[PDB]
Amino acid sequence: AVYFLLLDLRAEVDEEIAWARRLGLDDLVAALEAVRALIEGALATLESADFDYLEFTQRLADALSSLVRVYDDLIARLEEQPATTLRRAYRILLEYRRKEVRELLEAVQELRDVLETLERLSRRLGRPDFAGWLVSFVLDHYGELVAPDILTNPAKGFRALAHLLRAFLYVLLALKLRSPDEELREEARRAVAFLYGEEFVKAHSDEELAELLLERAREAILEAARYNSALREEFDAAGGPEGREAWLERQLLRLRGLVERFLELWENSELRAGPDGELVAVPGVKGLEIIKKLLEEGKGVNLALWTLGRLLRALDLSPEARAAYEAALEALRRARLQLQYVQSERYEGSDRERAEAIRAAFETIRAAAETIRAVIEADTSLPAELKAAYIEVIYAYLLQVAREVRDALWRLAEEILPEYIEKFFKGSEEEQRLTLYELLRALGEDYFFLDLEKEGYSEEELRELFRNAKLEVINADESGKIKLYNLILDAKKLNRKVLIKITLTELSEGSYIITIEVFKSPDAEIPEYEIRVAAVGATSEEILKYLEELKEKAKEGELIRELLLLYVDRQIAELEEKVANADKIDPVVARLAIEEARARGEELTEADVIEGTRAGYQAALDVLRRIKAELEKEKSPENPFYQFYDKLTEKLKEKGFVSEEEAFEIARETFGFPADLPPLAAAALRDFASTVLTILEIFKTAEDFSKWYKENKEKLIELAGLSEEELDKIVRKTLTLLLEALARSVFGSKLGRELLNEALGTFIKELLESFFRTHYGLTRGDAVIDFDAKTGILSLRFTPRAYARIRVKEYRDPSLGEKFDNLLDVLSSNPSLKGQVDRLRVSYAFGTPVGTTPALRDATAEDLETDPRLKRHRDFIEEVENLYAELLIRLEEALKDEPETVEILTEIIGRHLKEVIHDPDVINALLDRRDLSPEEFAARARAVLDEIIAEEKKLQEKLLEAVEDNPEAKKIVEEIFPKIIATIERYREWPERELAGLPL
Questions:
Q1: Residues 463-473, buried b or exposed e (16+ Cβ, 10 A)?
Q2: What is the distance between the alpha carbons of residues 813 and 666, in angstroms, rounded to a whole number?
Q3: Which label site among 245, 358, 677, 823 has the fewest CB atoms less than 10 Å from its CB?
Q4: Can you list the positions of beta strands (E) in 700-811?
Q5: Distances, alpha carbon 741 to alpha carbons 108, 505, 744, in Å
Q6: Measured at the alpha carbon of residue 351, what is the angle toward residues 346 and 352, in degrees to the nearest 5?
Q7: Residues in CB range of 908: below 8 A, 6 or more apart
Q8: Torsional sign, CA 843, 847, 850, 851
Q9: Torsion sign (Cα): 127, 129, 133, 135
């Protein structure tokens, strides 16, 4: 985000102020405090009720420019006046920091230029607010792509955003040129004339202009792919000019669809007179419907907040009401940022405080939303339909916030539950109902509460309704291990009943397993609401025994049968719901289908396409119902499903890894389906096979984890630096996630795979973080772990100071490296962690992300011992790093009287290592050689090595000038640096003929 970037800038300014105070420069603390004030002003303008993109970028650019000027003044004061060793070391560090800040400022200025161009273009056309809507739409549809870069490397994110905005504008103009409407063509012609001049537009036809603008869009998309990490990885994953052209065509098609949707949204908005007479645009019914559909899918928060702000600025109200609404919007934005803060890793409080803060933030958001709702309802200047659309948008936003809060509270359920568990086992019937109500409130079933509150039910009415509900307890067995409680909640106005089932499996005294299931109706078998499973106060051994018992019980095929029946019933209900809306076909979707059908050169009416789609849907529904009827049949040796399941189990036992395609082929062969089936039936069969495979893999993973943990508990305790409680807690979290995945697999294979990968990644991440924090004493923020659940990719980062300190400690004692290798081997002994462990091994060995280098994507931990070139590169890096570690230790010994000086030297050398050697360009040049002649590759490698030598010489000159006063430091530098130069030259001067590895 931008909040964390501004926080980091403010922290850097504070450190700068402290260092300035230390050295005695009291004449620049005023300028540094002014810079801090500017940064605080930017932080405040994020959270305001009149947030503007151009103004915010201008403020950020001004703050960065002021910081650069202050760095210039500090450096000038440092050289021009007499100085000592500490001052010159701080001088070099200041130069590095100023370089970084200047690069970030250049990126921000580029983004500001793009926004200014859009602003001027919108202003000339006479239709203001165009830039705001365009930027909000682009942000909504590309935040998930841009935000990670801003988190890691802000300049790349800013440049990618600018290029994507340019591409969006060009595609929009190209589409507007070819519109049949004359006014739209005239407006697009005016825009093109403004962009390129009267002469360029007066000598070209419309189709030529459209093609030129589409080519410009292609160039902008290519630039964005160049400057964006995810897009670059996707671009390199294709390979071949044909694949690249296909990728560009798909990108253009997606962008064209987005631009058509934006045009549909924009063409409905109309001008309404503002308080000062300025013409301001507010969306119609269809625009708000589009925004609500976006909000129901997890997007559209930017567009909704901008819509509310524009409604604020487009209404005439009394001063008190307008002030209240503005304050409500300010509080909404502030509490949103606070919630993102508390859910992050920067929070340092305990679990109870975290849950309390989450609840308080949600309460503030809800109160602000209620105030906005009351302000909207009080005004009577709008028709009923628009008001209803606005209230529905607010409802959707609050529902999304409620879902996030509920997920966080269910994550903290392990700490929330035990008090309510004891009270619920230690109470009477009325006390049981009170405990159930309070437990449901604490876990935040705010989605269901909001669904109740849609009709306007009050809190007191809800409390009375819950107090008058009917509760009955069922004893499954005489031993009383499993207890089932059924609760009925009825709605008088909606004429609906809600069923809640809670199962309490009492493993022992103080250990329980809770499964909370909510049904839309008691007569409906499919749970519309999710099924949640949590473990409270149960040790790892008890959970593992429970999992083994569950697998044994499901071996006979009952639980799997019920799960598959639930999944099939949900699929059938979804298909019926989709079919029932055949008369409500979206005109845009129908137009797209017609265009795609007619693009093949065949003049075919829509009737044939509709008939084909209906036949495909009918075939899919028929085969799904055939499968459902087959499942409901009694168990028999002649049942094909049992034979298919047995064959799949045997294949998993023997091989251990069967792809979804192979399972689908086996299912088709067993059922004998024709090869020329419609795509929908094949897709449904593939989904069924994927779900079965996912459940079988979950069971196999549980068994393997049980075995491996039972064998390596002691080794994990010894190596990870964990006590019994810590490792027990980690394993409890992993096994609870596994149980939740097994229970939620009925929603599809995607969710099950996501949750399984999340569990394994969390386990590995916690183990690694504990190992680093224990054996190196690093601060909690020095070593960070980034994990993506969607792709299952695990990374590693180190701050330059932490990296240099790690290298120094490892040089002082190799036992830390031996311990890390032993821990990685022990983790890799698990069959279910081998791939991630190998990828992490490669990433740690090279220090750069695997995605950035396509050559290392397929490399495993074994490949580092087979390819001579890879081992040569690794040895080069190891030798250089050892040389710098030796230099750092020698300089620390020679300057034992100045801890600050050695600290700053450590920072300098860490930054040098990060910037010069570990940049991905060198690795790409020296490893990636696809479709290049040998002479050009050799010349490029020699150029890179010469650049490295030049940078090393420059650093040598800087350091030698820095410590000219101290003799011992001079001798140490003169002894060490020529060794690095000679090593790099020897690596360069040695011919690469033998390292090529070409067979004779």
A1: eeebeeeeeee
A2: 55
A3: 245
A4: 783-784, 787-788, 793-794, 797-798
A5: 43, 18, 5
A6: 125
A7: 89, 92, 93, 96
A8: positive
A9: positive
**From the centroid of its chain, how far is CA 427?**
44
Angle value at C-alpha 433, between 429 and 439, nearest 5 degrees: 135
Query: The tokens of 430 are what?
Result: 């009325």
Q: Please, which residues bridge with residue 515 across strands?
A: 503, 533
Q: In Å, how far from its chain's centre is CA 248?
A: 24
Amino acid at 277: G
**How far is Cα 590 from Cα 201, in angstroms, rounded to an integer?**
34
Taking only Cα atoms into account, the Rg of the chain, rounded to an integer number of angstroms, comes to 32
Closest CA to 596 of 282, 157, 167, 256: 256
Which of left, alpha, beta for 803 (phi over 0: left; psi -120 to 50: alpha)?
Answer: alpha
Nearest residue to 314 via CA among 382, 242, 258:
382
Residues listed for the chain: 1000
Look up residue 276 and give its two tokens: 């000062």
Cβ atoms 878, 885 nearer than 8 A: no
Q: Which residues contact 696 (CB under 8 A, 6 or more apart)?
A: 648, 649, 652
Q: Resolution of this entry in Å? A: 3.4
Cα–Cα dist 648/663, whole Å:
8
Token reading at 219 = 């160039």
Q: How far lies 789's CA from each of 751, 760, 762, in Å?
A: 10, 10, 10
244 CB burial (10 A radius; 0-12, 13-18, 19+): middle
Nearest-angstrom CA–CA distance, 122 and 943:
47
DSSP state of 848: S
Strand 511-519, strand 531-536: pairing = antiparallel
Report the b/e string of 475-489 with b at 16+ CB within 10 A: eeeeeeeebebebeb
Method: cryo-EM
